[model samples]
Target chain A: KTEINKDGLTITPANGAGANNANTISVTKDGISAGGQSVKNVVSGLKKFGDANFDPLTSSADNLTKQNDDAYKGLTNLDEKGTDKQTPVVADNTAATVGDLRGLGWVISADKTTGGSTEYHDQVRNANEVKFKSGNGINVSGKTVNGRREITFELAK
Target chain B: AKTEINKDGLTITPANGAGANNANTISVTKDGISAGGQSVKNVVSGLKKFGDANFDPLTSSADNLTKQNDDAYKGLTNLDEKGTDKQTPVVADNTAATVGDLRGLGWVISADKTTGGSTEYHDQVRNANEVKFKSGNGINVSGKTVNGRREITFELA
Candidate 1:
């Protein structure tokens, strides 16, 4: 039976000589008690679990910090470079060679499957000709016909 | 005292008393002569034979000049067929030329022409096939999928 008095609300389990009288739940100005454990103990156990998990959270936070740092790396002046580095964007045509990625840069690698069958040229300002760095050192010329600019890459003689 | 003759001349006189030739006075220069009561065919025939076949009625200029020396002839012959027939203007394959041509003519084109689509991926900066963005300190990011839509959240650190 459940009853309330000035001692605060007390919950009584079923009574019989070994009838689980130990399972009393109670609530009062001192807070709640459950299954013979004081409310303070329950709260302390919760705090312990929180504290234990806090380390991994901190570590994950550090990872996030690193990610945020990585995200902001090339933002300010946008300075990133090299093979694994970020490729800078070139906004206009300026004189540049095949390996240029300077003001803005681009990289060229041989197509392994094609046995370097393709040739590449870097952006150059007012360049009417493109010179290949590969076999035969071929040169291709650009022309404007009928208001259309065209370039041809042909088999080198 | 009037008579008809095959020539390129005309004469006229005012009607008055005495009314010789029934007051039908006519005057013309050269061998063509005709009096009153004469059919109009003689005058028309004389005009047909004396006038140049290639004369421009609107300009009243001589049409006997050589093609090279004739401005009207040259202009008419040299007129562009494409312009006359309203041919569509062709442009270079690169957007610089294609867009520049229209822009030069004062056209305002939307930067993104694809209808009903977000431009985020198209304009976002990509690094090594991943999207990148900066973050403020103590900021966390999270995402949720609801009804086939993905929603991102920035959780407090």
Candidate 2:
């Protein structure tokens, strides 16, 4: 079973098969802290907003058209609750074991031949769909009927 | 009595009995003869040639019109494949890229674009006239010829 230290800031996963026993995230006086596989696995894929080299998991920069446009990264202008125009984003889930990513005003897919990776917004999929939080200025909903999924986008207030 | 014969053919109407009752339309040739309507017989002027009056080689508005109408009606009724009641305009939803929508918008792909996922599915046209394929990292296309047939190879890096 998972446990939280009495301080209410440290979280520890239960030690067992397929569990990262050494993993822990804690709130310290200075800032937040993480340990073991928690720090290595998650932060290994993340980068500061303006890093030089591109990380496949965190980089959404358009490497095709202009290639140097930093705004193409996933975190740039996703203020869905604000009234600003935003660049469209496409997710490429070709290597994903889960499924496609959906949230904000974007629908991420790994289907490249349909212009998902080469053409359209064209970005590699991150680790999980929940990595990109919902609601800043836009919200997306997905529904499935007859084995086909349909998506709808809404601007946040 | 009016007797006139010209190359164009014959014209017949009644003589003078209220709508010209007794009349006959006839054409004569070397092989066969043609006769119709408002009849009466009286070789008024020339000697009756009895060899043969051939009308086999004849062209007329009636025959041409009948043939043309037959062809046109046949064409009109020949629906390519039935499901539609009649031909009509196809409207496209600007937001969708379905085949029907693409066709309506005059976008035609050489092959099915949705078949291949991120992994390259190679395609070849036997009579390749400068075949070209575009892709991203880990995907490639190559071409060759085997036994007079053009072949295309798709590979994943």
Candidate 3:
């Protein structure tokens, strides 16, 4: 059960349920490795989006983090090779309202499987499901893989 | 013991055994009932029942296991014996789903349970093109981006 109390945000297992899993992973030049052995769980968050309303109860378990991270790697490689300045997601500031956000868009990704979490770069923007570039041995920005980033802010509902 | 009767040798017994162990019978002699047929040029007449010639072999097994399905198997189809008597929208008297009909409007379909669609239902429905729907005026169109499996609400407009 989840409770927002004086002791801060507390998440405890429901009655007759097992322990709260602390599933973590650490990656290096050699390879990536995950910790714990239990039912898979995806702890997903976002940076710069809406306030509360994303229900944790609706979240799922997953093992596609490595595959899902490849999109970010493509962006990083584009930064190095492509001539165009990389604005990962373009927010059309001139034309206002949510309707402007509608119509055609590009650069999006869906979760690899069920019990998986889907993360889009901009909560304000959306895109079609297409695999641009995804694999190992690709140049990336800060971290080699995209899964390393912790979401500082989120917009959800 | 030495003077035992030879009843088994005297009587003709069944080779495959008799009574409860094998063949059994009852002898009957009815004196009253008798019938005879006197006909000519009636070759194969009244030999077979009406409509027996057009019996469907597929339905014989289907009839037996009609409501008997295990973890899989669903639905069926048949034609009016026409080459082109295709089904069309009633155009005038289109009716809602009745009790005898399938449960239609109220319940939303579980994504992962469906097949033959483009996207993996187990994953998030990320693009408008990923799903299709129809408007009240019968104008068919695709759905907008939907992130994950959850209860959805919308206005008609």
Candidate 4:
């Protein structure tokens, strides 16, 4: 079990892939992020890549070409649904376990930007407005090329 | 007309590619016959000759093909290696020993082999009357060897 914040923000393996079922995401200074094992159903909503005879441990990650780029980790330009057919925001690298944010109840929103600031409009939710610096602060280590950031959600009263 | 020679038969002519005309030229002590061709004064002496014709081989190189088959078909696998060289009979699958299976036989397992190395038997010997040792190799089977292997015998009701 993972120690959760008072705001019901339990950072643990939500299912059961982890031994006791939860762990917080820990990032190292080397830019490599290590999250606890998926609690449960971590293999869901994901597809296998490369051709190496279905061996997980020995298979080489060669053909990282994606049919759906959002269905992976360390990817960007993903909408709230975890999918965007437009420009690819991430480089082809490691294998990813991905899902649809819309299916996970997330709303995409646009951040209000000042002059000389980058602006992004949420394709799913209109009420969600983000500040340029605030978005970068939220996903601090998330690179401009590749990253899977923590999705935000409105707390239900 | 029939012609017959009385004293000497056809005499061969002197060498130098001369025609003998069915008559051989006799060489005297002083006038030794001169020879033709490569070697001088050497007749067809001490020569080794071949048989009538060349031998034909049974198997041809073109007919040699790789046999893509299992080892079991060649009796290389799943074979019981038991019994001695002289008077030993193998008991096949004695657990379900049918009518035609070997009835009275004493197998010998070498000391160098493992448990199922040479001759293995399996059966419940209720009494000494159950087994009758043949006259040839009456060498009583050791209690240890017999107990180690499974013996096969017909049990009466």
Please write out the lDDT profile of model 2 over residues B4-68, one tens digit for every residue: 43333223333542233322433222212223332112211111111113211132233322322
- The lowest-lDDT stretch of 10 consecutive residues in candidate 2 chain B is B99-108
For candidate 1, lDDT tens digit of each residue in B1-157? Answer: 4333222222344444214543354433221222333222101101111123533333332222332243323222211111122342121121111111111111011223333576621321111122212223544333333343222323234
Model 1, A1-157: lDDT tens per residue? 4445667544544442123433444444543334342221001001111122222333344323322443222211112222332332211121111112111211112212112233212211221222222123233455665433444434455
Rank by TM-score, descending?
2, 1, 3, 4
Q: Residue B35, candidate 2: how far off, in angstroms?
A: 99
Candidate 2 global lDDT = 0.27
Report interface Cα RMSD per prediction. 45.7, 37.9, 32.0, 48.7
Most TM-score-accurate candidate = 2
lDDT accuracy of residue B42 in candidate 2: 21
Q: What is model 4's DockQ versus the real complex? A: 0.00
The TM-scores that each candidate's chain B achieves against the reference are: 0.18, 0.21, 0.15, 0.12
Candidate 4 to native Cα RMSD, angstroms: 46.4
Model 4 docking category = incorrect
In every candidate, how many clashes are there? Answer: 15, 15, 5, 22
Q: In model 3, which regions exceed 4 Å deviation?
A: A1-28, A37-45, A48-85, A89-157, B1-132, B136-157
lDDT of candidate 4 over B1-157, digit per residue (tens): 1222222221234444343431223211111122111111111111111111121122212111111122111211112322343122232321111111111111111122234457533332210112221111211111111222222111111
Per-residue lDDT for A78 in model 1? 17
